[PDB]
Amino acid sequence: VRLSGEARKQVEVFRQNLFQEAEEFLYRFLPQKIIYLNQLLQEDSLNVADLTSLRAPLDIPIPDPPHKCGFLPGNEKVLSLLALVKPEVWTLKEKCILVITWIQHLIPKIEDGNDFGVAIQEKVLERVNAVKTKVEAFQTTISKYFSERGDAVAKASKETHVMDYRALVHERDEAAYGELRAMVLDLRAFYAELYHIISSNLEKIVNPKGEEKPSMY
Amino acid sequence: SYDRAITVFSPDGHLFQVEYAQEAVKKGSTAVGVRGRDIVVLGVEKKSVAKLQDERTVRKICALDDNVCMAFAGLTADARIVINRARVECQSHRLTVEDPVTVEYITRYIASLKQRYTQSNGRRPFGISALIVGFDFDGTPRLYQTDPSGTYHAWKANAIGRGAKSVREFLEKNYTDEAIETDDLTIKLVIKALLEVVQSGGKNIELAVMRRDQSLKILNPEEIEKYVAEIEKEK
Amino acid sequence: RRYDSRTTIFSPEGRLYQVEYAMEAIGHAGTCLGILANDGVLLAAERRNIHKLLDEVFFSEKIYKLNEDMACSVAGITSDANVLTNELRLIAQRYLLQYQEPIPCEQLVTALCDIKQAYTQFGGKRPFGVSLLYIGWDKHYGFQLYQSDPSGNYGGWKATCIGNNSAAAVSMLKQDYKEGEMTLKSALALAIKVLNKTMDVSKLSAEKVEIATLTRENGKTVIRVLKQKEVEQLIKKHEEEEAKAEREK
Amino acid sequence: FRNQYDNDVTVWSPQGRIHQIEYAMEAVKQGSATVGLKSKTHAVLVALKRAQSELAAHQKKILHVDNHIGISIAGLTADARLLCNFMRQECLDSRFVFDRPLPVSRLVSLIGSKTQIPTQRYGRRPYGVGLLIAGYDDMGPHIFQTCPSANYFDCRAMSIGARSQSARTYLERHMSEFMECNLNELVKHGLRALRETLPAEQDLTTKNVSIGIVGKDLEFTIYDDDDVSPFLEGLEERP
Amino acid sequence: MFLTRSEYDRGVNTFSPEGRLFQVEYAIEAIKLGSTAIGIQTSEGVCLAVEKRITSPLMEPSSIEKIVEIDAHIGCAMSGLIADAKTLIDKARVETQNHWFTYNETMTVESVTQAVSNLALQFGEEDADPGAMSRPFGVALLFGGVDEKGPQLFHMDPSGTFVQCDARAIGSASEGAQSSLQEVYHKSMTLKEAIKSSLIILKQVMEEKLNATNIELATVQPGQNFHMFTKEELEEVIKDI
Amino acid sequence: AGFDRHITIFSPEGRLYQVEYAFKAINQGGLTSVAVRGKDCAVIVTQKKVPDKLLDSSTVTHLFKITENIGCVMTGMTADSRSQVQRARYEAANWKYKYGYEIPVDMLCKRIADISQVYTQNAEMRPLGCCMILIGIDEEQGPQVYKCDPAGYYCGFKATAAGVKQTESTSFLEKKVKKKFDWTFEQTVETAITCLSTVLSIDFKPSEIEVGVVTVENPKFRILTEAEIDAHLVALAER
Amino acid sequence: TGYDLSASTFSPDGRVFQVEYAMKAVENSSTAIGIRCKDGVVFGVEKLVLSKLYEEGSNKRLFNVDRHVGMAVAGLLADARSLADIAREEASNFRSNFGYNIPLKHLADRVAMYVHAYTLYSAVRPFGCSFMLGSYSVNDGAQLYMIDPSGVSYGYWGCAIGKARQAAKTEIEKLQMKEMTCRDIVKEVAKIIYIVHDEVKDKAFELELSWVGELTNGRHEIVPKDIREEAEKYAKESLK
Amino acid sequence: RGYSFSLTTFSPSGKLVQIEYALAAVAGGAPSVGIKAANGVVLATEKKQKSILYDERSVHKVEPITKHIGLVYSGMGPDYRVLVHRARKLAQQYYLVYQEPIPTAQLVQRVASVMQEYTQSGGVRPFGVSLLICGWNEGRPYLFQSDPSGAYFAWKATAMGKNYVNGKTFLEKRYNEDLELEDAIHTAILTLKESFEGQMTEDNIEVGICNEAGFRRLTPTEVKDYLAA
Known part of the structure; x- marks a missing residue:
């Protein structure tokens, strides 16, 4: 199609920015994030052993057998750990988007054969899309935690006589802590798996069809 | 889909198994050829000694006849078969027409053999490309290249095998009438070109020359050491 | 999807996977070893068949004599091995009939390797799932050791091993082998050492190995198989030496 | 699905139909149309030629096998050329051996056998070409058609190729008068018949028409672009 | 809505539904990969031209031979697979010399084209000989020669069909080059005009700027034999344009 | 699976299922044949079923004469x-x-069976879906009965059956040999007919069965007439 | 199920289905019948006229495979013509070697074995033709044989092949051919063919008849047109 | 996968799996036992018959190739006979060429070469049978096995067929090199007695012996006498 010089410049600018950003990300940002998440899971807060340390008071007046509930705070430990985790999961989703776009722009013209390189590109795309779905699952469950805990404490205050709702609130907090530590572990693992697969197959990823043939034609 | 048989054409008319054989050639060790005014130099990299192996058994450069030699990049056994077949054809041509083979004649024969193996299924293409060098009756230097497909082309200078793209870019830059002026300059040019893609200089290159009316000479390792030393010093 | 069938299709990236799968087969085989020395060349192999009710009727299970001036040891499929050895003997005797001189070692290896390449290239037949070592003396180049593979590619080696734990054998031989300093006795000791290292059995039985040596005596090559007493003495000497090296520490 | 049973000629279908032979019979439909018709004293072949481009010459659709036999092809030119070579050699062999012109019926029988052998065996494809064979012999004028299936027919008139049903119906409604026609009347009838097959925009020309005539006194002759103008001029116009 | 099953294209000797025999059609598609070649037939002669498509400067330009001599009277220009082209050129040459041997005369361009076409037809494998390539010949040839009928230009394709053509273009830009041929060509044009027009069209289609190196040009005239324009003659004409 | 559908390939249990299918092909016919040996005679009986009245009853037969003194009965595909x-x-x-x-008789059976072996080992051809039972007199060994099967097994027998009711028939015959007293010619024929009639439930008439015999007195294989068959049948019913 | 693809294969239940699929080929064909009587054998074919353009006396399904025998075919006409060439070759070879006209039973056996060769091998399909053979010789008598695509061969007092086989067979069954003579049998063959012909599905047919017998001095020949017209008029009259 | 069906295709990990399947076909075959005594070698196998109707004299599982060689099989009966005919023919060719009885080692080499010849071509299947080839040459006994693969081995004693592993263990427990054949036949029938799943009788087994005299199939009366113990 006819392209203006400005149009060609804009497209080439996007292309070069994407290529250089992908190189910078995989070579520099990924190792940094791997060690950062590693030390973070090594942090003592993520390695809490006695879960009753995590459970926080719910000041619901227990009903005496025959007045009102004060402000019920969120679990400070869990919300602080969430404040740590949320930047990481959103960052990983952003970087996986970047990798997807980089590989897709590297996909060559459709052709009948020599499709092994594009097959490699498709396989690594399958993997990066898989981790993308996984991080989206992380992103929805973090909101599910807040909604579920709020509903639970509302139920406990409404029906004081039921203690199972109180046990449920504590259980939601504990399950949330377990999910969060598994989450940071998975985030580090996803960064590392991206690095490994891309570094291993970079030659076919960047140059799928390969070097020019002797041209029998 | 269309890459499993040599006979079948693809949509858009690509025969892909021959392309795969041409790709197989790229795996092989590098080889380089250059035409000097009075010399043709053929240089090939050496993979590694392995310290319990005898170097004499492995030789990429070979003499088809008194006036023709080849180097190959690709499947070693296939190269051995093709070399033997070309040698017997050389002696048979001398038998038939009482004259020595021309370089274009022998490269045509080798290309025809490779073509014969491509055309029919039940046979796989020879996974080799070759660099054939010789001096014709007039005495002009000749350099030809062949590939699994069966096309042959004369080259002023060329490379085959792994790193062929890089070294041929270097050679497109470096090659000129000035460099071909001296035989030592031709040898130094090919040595520098192989140095462009090789782990170490003297140990990992096996080089040979053909002069106007002399047999093939594989340069001694001491001579190659002297030439790389001269090349190294000038930088 | 599948570019590994029919041995005549170059896969993308240009690899013949049938021959590679055949090369995989030799790794399962019993380890065979060959060492080159100044005065002679030897072949040593591990008799993988160690069933109690087997008879040692033959000259050797693994070692074969191809000619007056050379021998071979085989690792791979025994049937293809038998075929290849028969072809080798016929080739050598054809050369002797034509030129009335013994077949050169490299020429015989090259001929059989041409056969093995041919089986790769044409469609119907499978590649020979065999790798075998050749040892011989020729007037042109003296004592020589050669290795071949299913691909039809051969090389000359001072010392090499094929079969199971070949990498360990080669690693041990690399450090131990002294270029230009070996004698047949020292090479035999080295062979016992590397075989003991590679073979899973703690003690080399002296019925679980077969050793043969090629030497030139009185202007005529002699290919001899060391008898059970000789190899028993060798393993006893190696055990004593290794224990004394142990005792010092 | 039934993609199976279509791969090769050697596979019968569950309802007793060899689909590759039928797929070969589709090949004749691809080619430009041809018409053949006979009188008591003559047999005629007329064809519509096609051109790859304006600069290119029109293809050869009528071929002479012998003085007493000639053919016109619809379908693959390769198979046409091969079968024509076989027929020519058969006629030459008959003249060498017996010093008589080969009977046209016997020649089409030979064509049928040669064509049948591919259909039954694995390997060579069915000959995907349909031929109209026209000749004069002692018995009289004859017209035959051969399908990519080795079956052959004897015809008062016939048309093969693309859009040939129109020519067939014209021929059928006008057939009775053909037998007593002059050669000029007969070639004019055949020309109108192939004119039925053409697109409405297209019309008969000197270029795209070829005419082949054989008779008691006339050996097989192909009247080319310049020579068809006497026969074409009589025709009036499109209806 | 996409139906891409094909499932019949693979393997010659298979008539697909509608009886199209797609391997041959794919072979006819194959010549579009080749360099563009162009032929013009005139009363003064027939000219042939082709773009060499030099990959690298080091490659010798003379070695690329996309126009060749079958005999003095006939020359050929080819686009498509160089190897099977060489095979068909060999068949053409041996058939011309066999005709000279047997009948002491020169073949017509139509007869030579038919001779090579018969070889091209053998992909069908009707013959039992082993030495015939199963695949169709992936090349198109342009046969130009002066015969008893004067200058003649014949086109040959992978199918083995052949036709005379006043002007034809084969190769990648045959589509569009043929339209340019159709507009420019008139039967009366002299060979000088034909050479200039063919080189104009080749300049249009060729990606690289036209130069004496990257084209090959030839002409066979009634008085002359097959002739290739040298570097100097090519320089003169490409300057004249 | 795919381990069937070619005779050459072995199953992972090494069974060659295709020949086993050829064994089923014998039972697909719906006919049974029985052979029983005697001290001085050997007999073969088999069902004769005429699907249509129009069929000439003389032409349809499963009893054939390999040579003057050997006879066979075939069970399976007629062709x-x-x-x-x-x-x-x-x-x-x-x-x-x-x-x-x-x-x-044994060497004839061996030759036919090893031919069946070359069929079951080479790829392109299929095992013949039929079973043979040969009867003859050998001077040294007396009467003989032998059977070929599609696999190449050719074992000799005292008595045998083939077809759909083979298991029932051999169960019947096994009891009769176990209570071995002798078999003269009449008792041999009666045993064969009783076996076939009992396993089928047919209660035959002379047209429905065809019997062939060899005897040391008259070594030539002969196919008994309907009258002789009825003579044997009536004797069976009377006692 | 890949069992039906090839004739080398067997079904798991012991059936070679390609042969049955080839047997289904003949049922596509228009009917043909042959009746044997004391004097000789009469053949008849319902040759459907596909187009007015086609010449009469074309697409003949009645062939003469030797002077004393004739062949009537149903199924693929190409395969049938080829089988007729094979039968003619067999008859000529028999005459050349053994010095006399081939017995019909032997000829049927040889062509049947040639047919049966094809069911075995994978490379080549079964024939798509079922055909009847008939001859009269003073020694052998009147003989009618039918060969299926399998290579099964049998002798029939009356026989039918093609689309309307079953109806034709019952009509033939109620005939008593053994006592009758050929000049009546031609009329009854015409009657049966006209009965089984379906006017709605099949537009029109031209009755094609032949016989062999003593009346020919043992030569198979096409019916004289007067006798054809008489039989056809009788068939139209009886049809009502 | 595709490796399973093809015979000229090395599977990944380098296995010719169709041959392994042929060996599985051998394993299903009836038990056969071979014991090499000092003065002889005994070959034994079960000849279990489906019914009394079978005539035992008609066919034999133990066959002589030559005067001094005989063999027994476990696997496919037809394949056994193809190669027994070929073995007899090879031995006679040797006698024509050299005018000496063929050595047992040479015969097993040749028949194994035949068996290997069959495996290479795709159009054919391997022989679904293995053999125990026994002989007496140069005043020495011999026992050999030849598998479908085309390989051969020399066994002092071994078993093939059903329960061959258990039979081999029983043999190595019971085997002594000093055994005379009078004892070795007893050991062989015991080795088979492990694996019949029926009451063995003179008919149900077939056994043969080789010695300085040559190979012979000892009669039903002889095997009855030996079975009496």
Whole structure:
């Protein structure tokens, strides 16, 4: 199609920015994030052993057998750990988007054969899309935690006589802590798996069809 | 889909198994050829000694006849078969027409053999490309290249095998009438070109020359050491 | 999807996977070893068949004599091995009939390797799932050791091993082998050492190995198989030496 | 699905139909149309030629096998050329051996056998070409058609190729008068018949028409672009 | 809505539904990969031209031979697979010399084209000989020669069909080059005009700027034999344009 | 799976399922044949079923004469049966030509069976879906009964059956040999007929069965007439 | 199920289905019948006229495979013509070697074995033709044989092949051919063919008849047109 | 996968799996036992018959190739006979060429070469049978096995067929090199007695012996006498 010089410049600018950003990300940002998440899971807060340390008071007046509930705070430990985790999961989703776009722009013209390189590109795309779905699952469950805990404490205050709702609130907090530590572990693992697969197959990823043939034609 | 048989054409008319054989050639060790005014130099990299192996058994450069030699990049056994077949054809041509083979004649024969193996299924293409060098009756230097497909082309200078793209870019830059002026300059040019893609200089290159009316000479390792030393010093 | 069938299709990236799968087969085989020395060349192999009710009727299970001036040891499929050895003997005797001189070692290896390449290239037949070592003396180049593979590619080696734990054998031989300093006795000791290292059995039985040596005596090559007493003495000497090296520490 | 049973000629279908032979019979439909018709004293072949481009010459659709036999092809030119070579050699062999012109019926029988052998065996494809064979012999004028299936027919008139049903119906409604026609009347009838097959925009020309005539006194002759103008001029116009 | 099953294209000797025999059609598609070649037939002669498509400067330009001599009277220009082209050129040459041997005369361009076409037809494998390539010949040839009928230009394709053509273009830009041929060509044009027009069209289609190196040009005239324009003659004409 | 559908390939249990399917092909016919040996005679009986009245009853037969003194009964595909019969006749005549004496029944069975082996080992052809049972008199060994099967097994027998009711028939015959007293010619024929009639439940009439016999007194194989068959049948019913 | 693809294969239940699929080929064909009587054998074919353009006396399904025998075919006409060439070759070879006209039973056996060769091998398909053979010789008598695509061969007092086989067979069954003579049998063959012909599905047919017998001095020949017209008029009259 | 069906295709990990399947076909075959005594070698196998109707004299599982060689099989009966005919023919060719009885080692080499010849071509299947080839040459006994693969081995004693592993263990427990054949036949029938799943009788087994005299199939009366113990 006819392209203006400005149009060609804009497209080439996007292309070069994407290529250089992908190189910078995989070579520099990924190792940094791997060690950062590693030390973070090594942090003592993520390695809490006695879960009753995590459970926080719910000041619901227990009903005496025959007045009102004060402000019920969120679990400070869990919300602080969430404040740590949320930047990481959103960052990983952003970087996986970047990798997807980089590989897709590297996909060559459709052709009948020599499709092994594009097959490699498709396989690594399958993997990066898989981790993308996984991080989206992380992103929805973090909101599910807040909604579920709020509903639970509302139920406990409404029906004081039921203690199972109180046990449920504590259980939601504990399950949330377990999910969060598994989450940071998975985030580090996803960064590392991206690095490994891309570094291993970079030659076919960047140059799928390969070097020019002797041209029998 | 269309890459499993040599006979079948693809949509858009690509025969892909021959392309795969041409790709197989790229795996092989590098080889380089250059035409000097009075010399043709053929240089090939050496993979590694392995310290319990005898170097004499492995030789990429070979003499088809008194006036023709080849180097190959690709499947070693296939190269051995093709070399033997070309040698017997050389002696048979001398038998038939009482004259020595021309370089274009022998490269045509080798290309025809490779073509014969491509055309029919039940046979796989020879996974080799070759660099054939010789001096014709007039005495002009000749350099030809062949590939699994069966096309042959004369080259002023060329490379085959792994790193062929890089070294041929270097050679497109470096090659000129000035460099071909001296035989030592031709040898130094090919040595520098192989140095462009090789782990170490003297140990990992096996080089040979053909002069106007002399047999093939594989340069001694001491001579190659002297030439790389001269090349190294000038930088 | 599948570019590994029919041995005549170059896969993308240009690899013949049938021959590679055949090369995989030799790794399962019993380890065979060959060492080159100044005065002679030897072949040593591990008799993988160690069933109690087997008879040692033959000259050797693994070692074969191809000619007056050379021998071979085989690792791979025994049937293809038998075929290849028969072809080798016929080739050598054809050369002797034509030129009335013994077949050169490299020429015989090259001929059989041409056969093995041919089986790769044409469609119907499978590649020979065999790798075998050749040892011989020729007037042109003296004592020589050669290795071949299913691909039809051969090389000359001072010392090499094929079969199971070949990498360990080669690693041990690399450090131990002294270029230009070996004698047949020292090479035999080295062979016992590397075989003991590679073979899973703690003690080399002296019925679980077969050793043969090629030497030139009185202007005529002699290919001899060391008898059970000789190899028993060798393993006893190696055990004593290794224990004394142990005792010092 | 039934993609199976279509791969090769050697596979019968569950309802007793060899689909590759039928797929070969589709090949004749691809080619430009041809018409053949006979009188008591003559047999005629007329064809519509096609051109790859304006600069290119029109293809050869009528071929002479012998003085007493000639053919016109619809379908693959390769198979046409091969079968024509076989027929020519058969006629030459008959003249060498017996010093008589080969009977046209016997020649089409030979064509049928040669064509049948591919259909039954694995390997060579069915000959995907349909031929109209026209000749004069002692018995009289004859017209035959051969399908990519080795079956052959004897015809008062016939048309093969693309859009040939129109020519067939014209021929059928006008057939009775053909037998007593002059050669000029007969070639004019055949020309109108192939004119039925053409697109409405297209019309008969000197270029795209070829005419082949054989008779008691006339050996097989192909009247080319310049020579068809006497026969074409009589025709009036499109209806 | 996409139906891409094909499932019949693979393997010659298979008539697909509608009886199209797609391997041959794919072979006819194959010549579009080749360099563009162009032929013009005139009363003064027939000219042939082709773009060499030099990959690298080091490659010798003379070695690329996309126009060749079958005999003095006939020359050929080819686009498509160089190897099977060489095979068909060999068949053409041996058939011309066999005709000279047997009948002491020169073949017509139509007869030579038919001779090579018969070889091209053998992909069908009707013959039992082993030495015939199963695949169709992936090349198109342009046969130009002066015969008893004067200058003649014949086109040959992978199918083995052949036709005379006043002007034809084969190769990648045959589509569009043929339209340019159709507009420019008139039967009366002299060979000088034909050479200039063919080189104009080749300049249009060729990606690289036209130069004496990257084209090959030839002409066979009634008085002359097959002739290739040298570097100097090519320089003169490409300057004249 | 795919381990079936080709005779060459072995199953992972090494069974060659295709030949086992050829064994089923015998039972697909719906007919049974029985052979029983005697002290001085051997007999073969088999069902004769005429699907249509229009069929000539004389032409339809499963009893064939390989040579003057050997007879066979084929069970399975009619065409494969006739082909194997022709091959057996050729083998017998060729044996006589080469070696100067009539082929033994065992050697004929061995030749036919090893041919069946070459069929079950080579790829392209299929095992003939038929079973043969040969009866003859050997001077040294007396009467003989032998059976070929599609696999190449050729074992000799005292008595046997083939077809759909083979298991029932051999169960019946096994009891009769176990209570061995003897078999004269009449008792041999009666045992065969009773076995076939009992397993089928047919209660035959003379047209429904065809019997062939060999005897040391008259070595030539003969196919008994309907009258002789009815004579034997009436004797069975009377007692 | 890949069992039906090839004739080398067997079904798991012991059936070679390609042969049955080929047997289904003949049922596509228009009917043909042959009746044997004391004097000789009469053949008849319902040759459907596909187009007015086609010449009469074309697409003949009645062939003469030797002077004393004739062949009537149903199924693929190409395969049938080829089988007729094979039968003619067999008859000529028999005459050349053994010095006399081939017996019909032997000829049927040889062509049947040739047919049966094809069911075995994978490379080549079964024939798509079922055909009847008939001859009269003073020694052998009147003989009618039918060969299926399998290579099964049998002798029939009356026989039918093609689309309307079953109806034709019952009509033939109620005939008593053994006592009758050929000049009546031609009329009854015409009657049966006209009965089984379906006017709605099949537009029109031209009755094609032949016989062999003593009346020919043992030569198979096409019916004289007067006798054809008489039989056809009788068939139209009886049809009502 | 595709490796399973093809015979000229090395599977990944380098296995010719169709041959392994042929060996599985051998394993299903009836038990056969071979014991090499000092003065002889005994070959034994079960000849279990489906019914009394079978005539035992008609066919034999133990066959002589030559005067001094005989063999027994476990696997496919037809394949056994193809190669027994070929073995007899090879031995006679040797006698024509050299005018000496063929050595047992040479015969097993040749028949194994035949068996290997069959495996290479795709159009054919391997022989679904293995053999125990026994002989007496140069005043020495011999026992050999030849598998479908085309390989051969020399066994002092071994078993093939059903329960061959258990039979081999029983043999190595019971085997002594000093055994005379009078004892070795007893050991062989015991080795088979492990694996019949029926009451063995003179008919149900077939056994043969080789010695300085040559190979012979000892009669039903002889095997009855030996079975009496």
